[PDB]
Structure formats: C-alpha cells, structure tokens
Amino acid sequence: SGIGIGFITDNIILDLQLSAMEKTGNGEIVSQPKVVTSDKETAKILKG
Amino acid sequence: ELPYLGRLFRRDTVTDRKNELLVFLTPRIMNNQAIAI
Amino acid sequence: SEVPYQEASSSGATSTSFKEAALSLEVTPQITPDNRIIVEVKVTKDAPD
What we know:
Chain A is mainly β. Chain A has strands at residues 4-8, 14-18.
C-alpha cells in the first residue's frame, strides 16, 4: 500500500523507503424490531 | 535520536478503533386498539 | 422441508434428528363477540442451512 522509494542504482544501489499505511473503516448497523405482545405475557421476535 | 533521521528510523503505528453500541426502546400499547378490539 | 442432523453415535445414541424449516402458522384463536380474536400464534419462517 504505502511505499515511498528512493533508489540509487547507477553509482551504487542504495534504497531508502518510507513505507506507511493508514486504514480507516467505519461500520454502523441500526436494526429495529417491533413486537406485538399480550400484557404481562412474553412475545419474541427473532431474526437470525 | 537523530532529529532529521529519527523519523526515518522511528516506526510509529497508532490505531484508534472505537465502536459504540446503544439500544433504544419504545412500547406502543396495542390496548389502545386491543381495548377497541 | 425438514432439516435433519444425523449423529449416529454407535454406543447407544442415534440422533437421527430432524426439524422442518417450514413456513408455518400455529394458531389458537379465541373468538370474542365483536368479531375479534385473542389468538396464541406461532408464526415461524425457517430455512435449510
């Protein structure tokens, strides 16, 4: 990904590189399940 | 140690990964309809 | 369709299990006068893995 190459070869081969990586990842997941339940009773939505 | 070469000889890796998770909830009584039902 | 698991474990356990990943409605409706029902309903969708 990130390589900065300085090369001499003709006179001498002298290689000087600054190799840097910056990675950015953002993941956002927003899920909303709605369940209709009796009162004081259990009801269950399961999505899997 | 060298001021001009330390950056060229100091390898820095800094990573900040921050994930926040939050759960809301709202109950809408269906009795408003269930009493009428 | 009925997704099984066949664990045939010689020394006494033959888990010839199966379970149908079927759409389904299992309903127990109770009918109240104004053409209403309070029903215990299992509403399941499942599917072979």
